[PDB]
Amino acid sequence: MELITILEKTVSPDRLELEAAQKFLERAAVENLPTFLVELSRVLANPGNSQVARVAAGLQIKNSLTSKDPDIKAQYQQRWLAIDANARREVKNYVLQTLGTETYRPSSASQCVAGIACAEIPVNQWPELIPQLVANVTNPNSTEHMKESTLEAIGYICQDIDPEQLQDKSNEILTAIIQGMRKEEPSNNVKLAATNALLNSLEFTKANFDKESERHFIMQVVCEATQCPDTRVRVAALQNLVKIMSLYYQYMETYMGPALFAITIEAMKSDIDEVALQGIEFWSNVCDEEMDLAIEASEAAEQGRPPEHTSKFYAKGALQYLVPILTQTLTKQDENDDDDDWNPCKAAGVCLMLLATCCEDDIVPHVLPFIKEHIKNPDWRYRDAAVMAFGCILEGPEPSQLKPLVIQAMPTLIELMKDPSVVVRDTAAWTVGRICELLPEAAINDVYLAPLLQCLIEGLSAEPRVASNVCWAFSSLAEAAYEAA
């Protein structure tokens, strides 16, 4: 046989032609291990080769070097390791020159490079790599690919190793990553890749950020790229700014107000779902981190001593400007409605809750005016939001200021049970339950108890969820009895 048209078939559209050559060219795995890899390493290089051949090329080399399951990986790793220092030094060259000549998109080359990568360095057998890639981007005379392709590699390399191995390559690596994100940089495809690389790298550079010289610099570059026109890179930029926020909360005090708040609070109002999600996550993650510190304080306050680390209270401020987005976002909900998807309607509801449990008795006021103001609106959308928001804000706040609140709505909430809109129903049912779990007393009220239960029952023969919610309620109410004795 002749090795090209086979690779063409090594991934063909038919499950038998492929399954065939997928093994034929697997006999030379354990009976030709070396000799093979190389063969491809060149065909993967010479541009003359049709797409498939090339694409399929690295696919095989990539394949036989690494594994998905963190298990077998160990095995297929030492593989190219215990190999002959003859062909390795050969392949490692027919590939570092394949980039810039591949027309396709996710260029296979990046793949294999990274694969070999997690092994030619955890000991240091390929310490000439990093300087070479660096040259691909920092060098102004390089193809839109020559650059892209490269980064792609750098990114996989990070996404596959434990922090400890890359912690001292940072300076060398990062210097390149960021170069791909710069504003003056032409192709957004290079920018993109780069912004991704960062997402996988932030994880191991406490050293880098600790040096103000760089930090300032990184944050500048990330925020700039947050103003890039290509949606493709904005979602990348925010993802970093979100990761960074969970990662380096303490250092963010110098960027939050001048640069970050304006940026993240803006995004949330993006018509684009992907871009909003990111924005919400940010302030969502911020609460998480902040109310977590909130603990550090007390647990270390009763014991009588300085809190190891201190919060800076961002949610509290922006609270005013947040909610009136979170709430207004509790409207961009999917029609057909999928239950496991992650669209703003959720993030908003979720974050609207977390905030409600960190800011405490400060949220009650900023949210009410939206409920009263949307309990009657025609569009069900602005209606269920009203309910939902009332549902969210029941954790955190002191009951000695909710019990009274609910009661006034409690009644006009029951009427929402059989609200002509199917979504208002479901949500109205969900709240009720949440109003039994959190606040037991203020629910069992004669004034509207009799009219209550008689509507919960009525719900048992309704839609699953709803019914499967009246339970979250009846149950709760009962437990509230075994507790009062």
Next chain:
Amino acid sequence: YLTQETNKVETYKEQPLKTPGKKKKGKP
């Protein structure tokens, strides 16, 4: 073809499970 990622998910305390929301979290 299945390249790397786009990852960024969350929902704290019973993460990617869905439903309207979850239950309380308490202390000492």
